[PDB]
């Protein structure tokens, strides 16, 4: 006589699976933001080097 | 040059974060509706 509790038990596991998916997405987002800060700094250093090099190439 | 590789990695990371944030937003509204309806079905 638990067919009424299987409804709240299936909905509880859907909530737990959604919490697990949210946690996995936030960890991927956190690591992607760390690499984006690493890549944005490398893009600035390389764009500054390309700008400071061509700026010196004058007549 | 080394700049074409830096712009591609930044653009690829910006696209991944955008798609991850869209999944996160859709998962949060699905979670908020699942818990609000589960608490309604409880005493």
Tokens encoding A2: 């638990």
CB B21 within 8 A of CB A36: no
CB B33 within 8 A of CB A17: no
Three-state secondary structure string covering A1-40: CCCCHHHHHHHHHHHHHHHHHHHHHHHHHHHHHHHHHHHH
Closest residue in B to A16 (Cα) is: B31
**Nearest CB to A36; choose among B7, B14, B35:** B14
User: Whole-angstrom Cα distance, residue A4 to residue A58?
Assistant: 82
Range B1-35 burial, b when 16+ CB lie within 10 A, else e? eeeeebeebbeebeeebeebeeebeebeeebeebb
CA gyration radius for chain B? 19
- Beta-carbon contacts below 8 Å between A and B: 62
Tally of CB atoms within 10 A around A10: 9
Tokens encoding B27: 């998962």
Domain boundaries, chain A: 1-59
- CA angle B22/B27/B29 to nearest 5° reads 100
How far does B9 lie from chain A, in Å, by closest CA? Answer: 7
How far does B15 lie from chain A, in Å, by closest CA? Answer: 10
Contacts with B9 from chain A: Cβ below 8 Å: 39, 43
User: Whole-angstrom Cα distance, residue A40 to residue B35?
Assistant: 39
For chain B, how far is it from start to end, CA to CA, in angstroms? 65
How far does B8 lie from chain A, in Å, by closest CA? Answer: 10
């Amino acid at each position: 006589h638990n067919i009424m509790n299987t409804q709240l038990k299936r909905a509880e596991s859907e909530v737990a699976a959604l919490n697990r998916r949210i946690q996995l997405l936030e960890e991927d987002l956190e690591r992607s933001e760390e690499r984006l800060g690493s890549a944005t700094a490398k893009l600035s250093e390389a764009s500054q080097a390309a700008d400071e090099s061509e700026r010196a190439r004058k007549i």
